[PDB]
Amino acid sequence: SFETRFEKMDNLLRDPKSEVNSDCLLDGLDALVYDLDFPALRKNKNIDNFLSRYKDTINKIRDLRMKAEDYEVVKVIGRGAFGEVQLVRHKSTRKVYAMKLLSKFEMIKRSDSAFFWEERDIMAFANSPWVVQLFYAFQDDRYLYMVMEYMPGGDLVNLMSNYDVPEKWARFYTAEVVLALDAIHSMGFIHRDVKPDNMLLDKSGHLKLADFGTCMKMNKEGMVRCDTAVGTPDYISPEVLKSQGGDGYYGRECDWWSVGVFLYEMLVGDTPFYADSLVGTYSKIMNHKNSLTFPDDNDISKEAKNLICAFLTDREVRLGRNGVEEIKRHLFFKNDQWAWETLRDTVAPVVPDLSSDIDTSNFDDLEETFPIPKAFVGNQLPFVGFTYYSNRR
Amino acid sequence: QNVKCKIVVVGDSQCGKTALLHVFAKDCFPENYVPTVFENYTASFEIDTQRIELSLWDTSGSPYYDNVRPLSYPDSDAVLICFDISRPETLDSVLKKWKGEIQEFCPNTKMLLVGCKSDLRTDVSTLVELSNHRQTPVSYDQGANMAKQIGAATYIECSALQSENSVRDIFHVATLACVNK
Ligand SMILES: Nc1nc2c(ncn2[C@@H]2O[C@H](COP(=O)(O)OP(=O)(O)OP(=O)(O)O)[C@@H](O)[C@H]2O)c(=O)[nH]1
Ligand SMILES: Nc1ncnc2c1ncn2[C@@H]1O[C@H](COP(=O)(O)OP(=O)(O)NP(=O)(O)O)[C@@H](O)[C@H]1O
Ligand SMILES: [Mg+2]
Ligand SMILES: [Mg+2]
């Protein structure tokens, strides 16, 4: 009728999962008045005697919406693709989050103006203890921002280089991944970039994942169509690889393979398909039935070398092909130390040694721009709807 | 104009060079062996969304032609040195002759060891025959432990005959040797 109009409507400006919750319409305008504030463009009286209309409020506003310098920063604990990731303390709230920055200019040059929207959903909406909580997501003119709960444990690589991982342990860190993946599968998706660089540790010693650029909601029947290669090249699936230029079409067995390559980097110290060359590490993978090989070690328990070889294999054969369940059942997770629903409940294998609200001991240490629009570019564009706060009870 | 890389193939006679360039660039395995000489297959590949254009060069392995084969090296982007997995004779040859003749005409060009006819490694016939000479087919390790001793970028195998993909998986690996540069 009519009430259920101005009704079904209002609960669509609050709905965060919406394309238009207030915070998004904002994000809209803000990002437009950025793309018309040019002398070039105002030779036209539409732009000029409109941007005039909204000067004295478009200013009054960028002043409020969680602006970037609301945060002062501690250490920078990660550079990467597009810009860095810093450990920040909120100048007001005194709370410590871990801010991800995205270089806007360099993100439209590398022609990836949207690979993150799934990382927004996942991080902020899959309420999970396997997922790194996304607390606020705000933008300005030059960059993007994602304020994430901070993980003082470090990546898994900081670990494998500072300890010589035992099987007792590779049983743990592995099955805590297996869980955090069947998480992200039955949240609808598929990860694809599955490496120790992307596994962090909460102050409790247990594990969470971050970086979800690569992700992608599976179609109706469980697969995906994609003709581009993705993820670090040591851990890359053979299906995800030979897709690079070809009718690539894969399920979620491609996260599974990545896991075997990890159960290996842990128990042997180097990766299973290493090679000098970007192209040399790809040829080891291709010839996997022939190139995979363990050193002069038979201390590698029979049933561990035996799991690695069930993941590292053709996709139609690969363990997990017929259920995330036949994985939990491997003779390799036998132990008087637990069963599964209690895993992140138990006590870590290695527990982080921290001194203060922000000890980055487990971490190591570390202005281009735009062209003034002739006509109307539309740069600040598919960066809209990206804002999201918390408040929601 | 789309990116265009040039690719040359050398190797002992009958190792299966023309078996494979014909499978990849013409989608059918050759019915009758004929000692190729020069021949210019014209293929096309795809890395990540975009087209590379491929110009392939088949050659002779016969010493009779040691004098002419080197007219194809000039300005290559990537060369494929070959050996027949069912004859260790032809690998002690990717060392005697081919490392040297490639090192010297296309020196500033990625080279790349490829073992052909891999499907014969499990044929009771070409074993029963290789033992009647105190020989025994080339094992993957015998293969790479050669390639990394002659300076190849990677070693890779393929049954030019059995599964079509084993060959695509080759021109995939080597498109990348051209373009990655
Ligand atoms: N099983 C198997 N047989 C092959 C394969 N490749 C070639 N052959 C056989 O071996 C013969 C040699 O193949 P070719 O490639 O045409 O000969 P070539 O290597 O070009 O030798 P050249 O005279 O120097 O050009 C062919 O008649 C095929 O019957 C292969 O990959 N697997
Ligand atoms: N929520 C977090 N808490 C603590 N450290 C983090 C967090 N998120 C990212 N890091 C660190 O930043 C590194 C890489 O993070 P990421 O944002 O994924 O960079 P990247 O651009 O994805 N690198 P690439 O694989 O080439 O795309 C990790 O190895 C961590 O050390
Ligand atoms: Mg990373
Ligand atoms: Mg021939």
Short mmCIF file of C-alpha atoms in Angstrom, two decimals, chain B residues 5-12 17 37-38 40 55-62 65-82 97-111:
data_model
loop_
_atom_site.label_atom_id
_atom_site.label_comp_id
_atom_site.label_asym_id
_atom_site.label_seq_id
_atom_site.Cartn_x
_atom_site.Cartn_y
_atom_site.Cartn_z
CA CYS B 5 56.93 -13.40 -29.95
CA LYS B 6 59.08 -15.76 -32.08
CA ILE B 7 59.82 -19.40 -31.10
CA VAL B 8 62.36 -21.87 -32.58
CA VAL B 9 62.57 -25.68 -32.08
CA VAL B 10 65.80 -27.71 -32.46
CA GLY B 11 66.51 -31.31 -31.66
CA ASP B 12 67.97 -34.66 -32.69
CA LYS B 17 59.53 -31.73 -32.68
CA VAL B 37 63.64 -29.12 -42.72
CA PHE B 38 62.36 -25.64 -42.12
CA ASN B 40 56.72 -22.11 -40.19
CA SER B 55 55.45 -17.56 -34.81
CA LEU B 56 56.78 -21.10 -34.52
CA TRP B 57 59.81 -22.58 -36.32
CA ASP B 58 60.23 -26.31 -36.91
CA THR B 59 63.68 -27.58 -38.01
CA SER B 60 65.94 -30.51 -38.90
CA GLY B 61 67.90 -32.61 -36.46
CA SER B 62 69.91 -34.17 -39.21
CA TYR B 65 71.60 -29.62 -42.31
CA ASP B 66 73.97 -28.36 -39.61
CA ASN B 67 74.80 -25.70 -42.20
CA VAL B 68 71.32 -24.20 -42.71
CA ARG B 69 69.27 -24.70 -39.51
CA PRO B 70 71.04 -21.66 -37.97
CA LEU B 71 69.19 -19.32 -40.36
CA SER B 72 66.23 -19.35 -37.98
CA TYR B 73 67.94 -18.32 -34.73
CA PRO B 74 68.53 -14.64 -35.68
CA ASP B 75 66.35 -12.56 -33.34
CA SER B 76 64.32 -15.19 -31.48
CA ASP B 77 62.42 -14.61 -28.26
CA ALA B 78 62.75 -18.14 -26.92
CA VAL B 79 64.14 -21.50 -28.10
CA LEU B 80 63.04 -25.10 -27.37
CA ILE B 81 65.79 -27.76 -27.11
CA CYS B 82 64.37 -31.29 -27.45
CA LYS B 97 75.69 -30.22 -29.61
CA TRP B 98 72.55 -28.23 -28.79
CA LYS B 99 73.77 -26.27 -25.73
CA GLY B 100 76.74 -25.21 -27.85
CA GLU B 101 74.89 -24.40 -31.07
CA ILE B 102 72.25 -22.45 -29.17
CA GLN B 103 74.71 -20.73 -26.87
CA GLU B 104 76.36 -19.33 -29.97
CA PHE B 105 73.65 -17.99 -32.34
CA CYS B 106 70.78 -17.07 -30.06
CA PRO B 107 72.87 -16.35 -26.91
CA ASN B 108 70.67 -13.55 -25.62
CA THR B 109 67.48 -15.62 -25.91
CA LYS B 110 65.78 -17.75 -23.21
CA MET B 111 66.36 -21.49 -23.83
#
